[PDB]
């Protein structure tokens, strides 16, 4: 079981996007590009995701995460589960939540975090990503 | 986790159809307009299908069914199940039979259940369903 | 028994207001025109009441919130539990506290959360409600 | 208390025709309960209701009886379709304290629950309901 | 060889409908049987029959199949009617080897023999029949 | 369920030739799996693989046959040439539950998974993939 | 086993830069100038930096710190271990993560860390950094 | 840590080279362009190398190797050990052997495998290399 630590850095306050965790992984080069391009299966177990707070505390706004666990949205739609944008966080999906007990080819991604924010337009953190992933059936 | 009794009712003798486990389940509003918009991730671990018999003695036939574990069916081919429309029926699925081994997108039919009956087109029963499943990272 | 998680966003560092948990919890459609709309009896065990602050450091206030087991309140009479809203808070409410040990008819509230804030009017952050509820008699 | 256990019946249930039952002190079908003891007691609860199909129907009868169990009398007519009884079999039903809102006391100027019932059948006659209903009753008058 | 069991049935059997049932490469009733097995032996015998009828026919429904037993597929449509199950009531009848030219080995590309039957009631449905063979394979392909 | 254990042949393996077998309704090489059972079950599930290489080559050819395991189907040709048999020696190789995607039922309509291959060697007869894949299959049709 | 404390002051915002744990280590004149100039060998057994916010709440940044245990790097390069400069934080190397279980010669540095920061270039905090020590072989 | 397979295939019977094991080993993409850029140290703890012979019978020759511990050979010179082309060899070095003891930085060799055949020009057979490594620090 491998380990991938990465980072999407300098997440403004209204960023919204989308991190999708297999082969669409470009903010992780050595996962993406790396792992994955010589296996042909792979799980995510575990995603630990931290919102680490670079925003000045006069930066109203909150970062919004989504965890979808079946690529099946291009933008987030849960305002729920959230960070304030100048409070450290982090959040950790087991197994169960992120879709990840079967294995998956390495050509489709397992799950996806899209993250929304409604801050200013100023720097507010960025998403440490943790990722304990094992691999099988080497190429 | 939730169990969930709903009915296909007025069922005539020779009434064919699908009962689709998901977002096409219009039946139980519980379900469908409900637990499903509260949720991302379900599995129904468990399937009860019971046929209630309202239909006259003095008629003939049966109501086959087939289970389709995942939805490539639209109507019915096998006839190896059935419930006769004078004798009141019920079947078990588990988790394995019915495809909730592993989770499923709200916006996706975990299976569905076929019938025809080649009765008349008289009143034959009423299928009483009973769904026992379970929902995962809340929307 | 089970959860509904939903959010009340935007709240305004002045925002006043009921949030009622039954039939008029329009906040949360999948309660309110979900279960509800298909069952007799419900019971909410427990109330999560979590204030995340997205409030800027530079915001003077707090949101005072009043837990009518009743419903007999329109309006946040006791202004002694508050959260200020520049600090994240968190709350929960057992079931002898919300009126929620005896089952209601989906048709009355079982109780309401008054909140009212005295701060200036950008936003202050959201109130996520985590309700842990029970069903019976399904219709 | 007092412990009571009324067994009254509605009969002459149409195969179509549609009513509903309300226990407490509009309870004429059991004259000895709505009349009876709820005259000479303060409160009361239903503590058990035991719903029983005694079918007067034919082999050649197609229907069914649906009865659903209101807890708090705010329905007036059927609503759904799921519990019910075929019109040619006998059935039997048992609703414990908390499904008939039978855990607290009630005054005896309030209905503690009802039972309505609705059948899709022929007008013929379909059976009768016998029910019972043990009750426990306080603070004597 | 291999001794295998198939239990396949002919279902929705009207009362007045007629048809027939080649066992062999033609069974189409019992796909894993026709082209299954028959896909993957040179040989087959069919050593037993158990032809079985279901009734899903109401008390009410007069009639009866006659079910013919032609062992050699000479013959297309009923012929005679001494053999026969009423349409109300489950009937059993087992063929021996014999009976169902079961003593010699079949290559895969002949039909063994066939169940012609004809029934004498009316449009409505009638039963279905089980029937189950017990079959042995020879010279793997 | 049903526990199958099917024993087939992939014949006449060239040392060059390469291609792919595609366990699931496409297993034409085992007319008794691909049109056999999957013709009467909604679900199946390949719980083990036995692959072996059964050799037919003399002491002097040079070479070998690459197998890839691909999972999912995914891949039409070979990719990876890590596993490999010598085409001079019979080989064994037995893949598990979870290496062939055999841990969750697939409906019959979609393949397994599959096994590609690709000899290094020379166009000369190289050797036999004796395959036995022991299945589960659920839901009679 | 000794112990030298000692404090990297006046860390703007912005500052970028490495500290080298060796006879270089300048910021500790008792290390560099002072054990190491009369020893053979060497190791730094365990390392606790921690970064003491002395920025105002109205500085968004962050420093991230990159431990390169063999000196290959003079800029950092990896922006995934950081601190927020409004937000004191702490973090404890052990030996093996700073290449320190074998002896060196007091004339090469054992590790660096280097430090980049993104913030603005007002005084942004301190590094406080805990070196546990060994040496051998008196000269 | 990590168990890579790879190979090195279509080895003349005289074909001679060196398997550099870290940045250099071109042969696996999922550890030089993988797992090299997602950590700073690393280490191979154990290396399995099996021949597996493709060669004809009918033909001589052997393949001689040297593990070369510290990357200062870069042509074969010692001939002791050797796996035979008619026969299927295993050799299995473990830590103290590959110089695997302590961590190196993932722009060094950790250590490096010269072979060199005296066969003839025909395919001899294949190496296939087994690295059980170890990796740490994440970048």
Redesign the interface.
């Known amino acids: 079981s491998?380990?991938?630590?990465?980072?999407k850095?300098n997440l403004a306050g209204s960023s919204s996007g989308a991190i999708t965790f297999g082969p669409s992984l470009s903010d992780?080069?050595?996962?993406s590009?790396?792992?994955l391009?010589?296996?042909?299966?792979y799980k995510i177990s575990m995603v630990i995701l931290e919102f680490?707070?670079?925003?000045?505390?006069?930066?109203?706004?909150?970062i919004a995460y989504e965890?979808?666990?079946?690529c099946?949205l291009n933008s987030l739609?849960?305002?729920?589960n959230?960070f304030?944008?100048?409070?450290?966080g982090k959040r950790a999906f087991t197994a169960?939540?992120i879709?990840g007990?079967?294995?998956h080819?390495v050509?489709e991604d397992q799950f996806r975090i899209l993250y929304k924010g409604?801050?200013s337009s100023?720097?507010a953190?960025?998403f440490?990503i943790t990722i304990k992933c094992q691999?099988?059936?080497?190429?």
Chains 1, 2, 3, 7, 8 share one sequence.
């Open positions: 491998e380990t991938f630590v990465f980072s850095d992780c080069p050595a996962f590009n790396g792992m391009k010589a296996y042909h299966e680490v707070s670079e925003a000045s505390s006069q930066n109203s706004g909150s965890l979808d666990p079946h099946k739609s849960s305002t729920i959230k304030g944008i100048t409070k450290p169960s939540y879709n007990t079967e294995w080819d050509a409604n801050g100023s720097i953190g960025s440490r691999f099988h059936n080497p190429k």
